[PDB]
Amino acid sequence: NYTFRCLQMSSFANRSWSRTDSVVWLGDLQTHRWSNDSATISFTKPWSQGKLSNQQWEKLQHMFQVYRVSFTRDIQELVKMMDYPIEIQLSAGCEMYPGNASESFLHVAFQGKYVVRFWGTSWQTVPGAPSWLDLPIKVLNADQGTSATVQMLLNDTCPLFVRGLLEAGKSDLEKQEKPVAWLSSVPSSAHGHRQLVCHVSGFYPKPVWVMWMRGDQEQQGTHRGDFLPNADETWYLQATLDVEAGEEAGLACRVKHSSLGGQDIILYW
Amino acid sequence: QKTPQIQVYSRHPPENGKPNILNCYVTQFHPPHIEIQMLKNGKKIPKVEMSDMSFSKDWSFYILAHTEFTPTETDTYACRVKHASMAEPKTVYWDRDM
Numbered sequence A: 001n002y003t004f005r006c007l008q009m010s011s012f013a014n015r016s017w018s019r020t021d022s023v024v025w026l027g028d029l030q031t032h033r034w035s036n037d038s039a040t041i042s043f044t045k046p047w048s049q050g051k052l053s054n055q056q057w058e059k060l061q062h063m064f065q066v067y068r069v070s071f072t073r074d075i076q077e078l079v080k081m082m083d084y085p086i087e088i089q090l091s092a093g094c095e096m097y098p099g100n101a102s103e104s105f106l107h108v109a110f111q112g113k114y115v116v117r118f119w120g121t122s123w124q125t126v127p128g129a130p131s132w133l134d135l136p137i138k139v140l141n142a143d144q145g146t147s148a149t150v151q152m153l154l155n156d157t158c159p160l161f162v163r164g165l166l167e168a169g170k171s172d173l174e175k176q177e178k179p180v181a182w183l184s185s186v187p188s189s190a191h192g193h194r195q196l197v198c199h200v201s202g203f204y205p206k207p208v209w210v211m212w213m214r215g216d217q218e219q220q221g222t223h224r225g226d227f228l229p230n231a232d233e234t235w236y237l238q239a240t241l242d243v244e245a246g247e248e249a250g251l252a253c254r255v256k257h258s259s260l261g262g263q264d265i266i267l268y269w
Numbered sequence B: 001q002k003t004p005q006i007q008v009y010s011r012h013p014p015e016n017g018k019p020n021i022l023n024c025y026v027t028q029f030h031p032p033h034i035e036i037q038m039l040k041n042g043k044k045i046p047k048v049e050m051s052d053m054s055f056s057k058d059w060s061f062y063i064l065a066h067t068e069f070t071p072t073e074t075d076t077y078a079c080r081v082k083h084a085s086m087a088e089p090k091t092v093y094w095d096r097d098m
């Protein structure tokens, strides 16, 4: 069960300066990058072409090459009619559900706020979006050639492409990397208290279980941090526990993960 | 405008004298223009590698910086961020214990 996301980020500083950059993700692994200063889309995995032939890939890329130029012109022309600086983001792709099913999306943000989506056969402003967008969305919807292309991309190309990625990238998507854990501590705010920290790093895939323990008893004070990326496509997480000084003894951190073969890591404080 | 959050953490368990990698993960910011420096004893580390900038479900940007480092008993490491949301740079120190 995976979500394929193409993320476009465009900054328009004035009528002479703009750039558009994109990154593409399959779940939590980056599959493409497309820098403003590259003519072509870059692969960031060996399998980033999926099961598309070189001809199909080149066709697909050419359309994006045209889009990137047209997009930039459209926005510059729009700002002249209607100011700077302007940030526009697009998030498009599809979510693959079990038994062949999938749903596609194309969402657009202006100045960091979701304003427009493509839905069915047309562009729509979302409720609460500024009313000045209605007219340019009307004009965009008159372009039926663009509408039909976006329909093809969302309905056909996205799920097709992603099926091929899942097959082609199987050994990477299903890779297992073991967490390594360690313990440390800092003083707490209030007197006679300490924050114990269980650090867990290098694990893949993302799902993991980390708890402070007293024997078989979970310590419900366990405060799990956010999932933080390492630079080598593994994850980092820490879990903290506020403890009274001289109540440290008998505490352990326990880590469960798919890569460990049913043998949890247990570190003792 | 959204203010960047900064988290500093090592790739491997720190051991004094042993080469490791220090990560600085910067999140929750907008607009995307940003300057990120990693510092050793207050001095800019030259070799710093950056991921491609990306953004989250909520549209805020994130980026990961990392560099090789060898922790010792006496060296301090930090990550310093300049962004239009803040009048001054924000510095977060690596604390192996935190």
Ligand SMILES: CCCCCCCCCCCC(=O)N[C@@H](CO[C@H]1O[C@H](CO)[C@H](O)[C@H](O)[C@H]1O)[C@H](O)[C@H](O)CCCC(=O)NCCCCCCc1ccccc1
Residues within 6 Å of the ligand: A006, A007, A008, A063, A066, A067, A068, A070, A071, A074, A078, A088, A090, A091, A092, A106, A108, A109, A110, A116, A136, A140, A143, A144, A145, A146, A149, A150
């Ligand atoms: C993340 C992935 C990107 C998803 C995106 C779709 C990629 C496929 C497009 C292929 C067709 C396209 O490029 N159309 C371009 C070229 O069109 C000509 O040529 C085409 C073929 O070459 C067809 O023959 C057309 O009939 C013909 O008019 C159009 O010039 C098109 O108008 C440019 C792209 C417009 C577009 O979609 N923009 C993103 C949506 C933003 C909506 C407005 C948002 C906004 C506005 C102001 C302020 C803030 C926000």
Ligand SMILES: *[C@@H]1O[C@H](CO[C@@H]2O[C@@H](C)[C@@H](O)[C@@H](O)[C@@H]2O)[C@@H](O[C@@H]2O[C@H](CO)[C@@H](O)[C@H](O)[C@H]2NC(C)=O)[C@H](O)[C@H]1NC(C)=O
Residues within 6 Å of the ligand: A102, A103, A104, A105, A106, A118, A119, A120, A121, A151, A152, A154, A155
């Ligand atoms: C493409 O599919 C849409 C419907 O799919 C939905 O919208 C897409 C953008 C995508 O995000 C999907 O996951 C969504 O579930 C078709 O639009 C429908 O067409 C039917 C049949 O003519 C019509 O009765 C409906 O009104 C349309 N649905 C909506 C919600 O507007 C569209 O025709 C398909 N286009 C092609 C070329 O296949």
Ligand SMILES: CCCCCCCCCCCCCCCC(=O)O
Residues within 6 Å of the ligand: A006, A007, A008, A022, A024, A032, A034, A041, A060, A064, A068, A090, A092, A093, A106, A150, A153, A154, A157, A158, A161
């Ligand atoms: C409408 C987009 C969904 C369909 C995408 C299926 C093909 C994926 C190809 C990956 C290349 C990414 C190109 C990014 C283009 C951009 O955002 O400007």
Ligand SMILES: *[C@@H]1O[C@H](CO)[C@@H](O)[C@H](O)[C@H]1NC(C)=O
Residues within 6 Å of the ligand: A013, A014, A016, A017
């Ligand atoms: C346009 O923006 C760029 C980048 O911010 C800047 O260097 C340049 O001064 C701007 N151009 C004008 C004409 O102000």
Ligand SMILES: *[C@@H]1O[C@H](CO)[C@@H](O)[C@H](O)[C@H]1NC(C)=O
Residues within 6 Å of the ligand: A017, A018, A019, A020, A036, A037
């Ligand atoms: C981005 O790419 C476009 C098209 O190649 C180019 O004209 C523009 O100058 C680039 N922008 C920057 C800021 O480099």
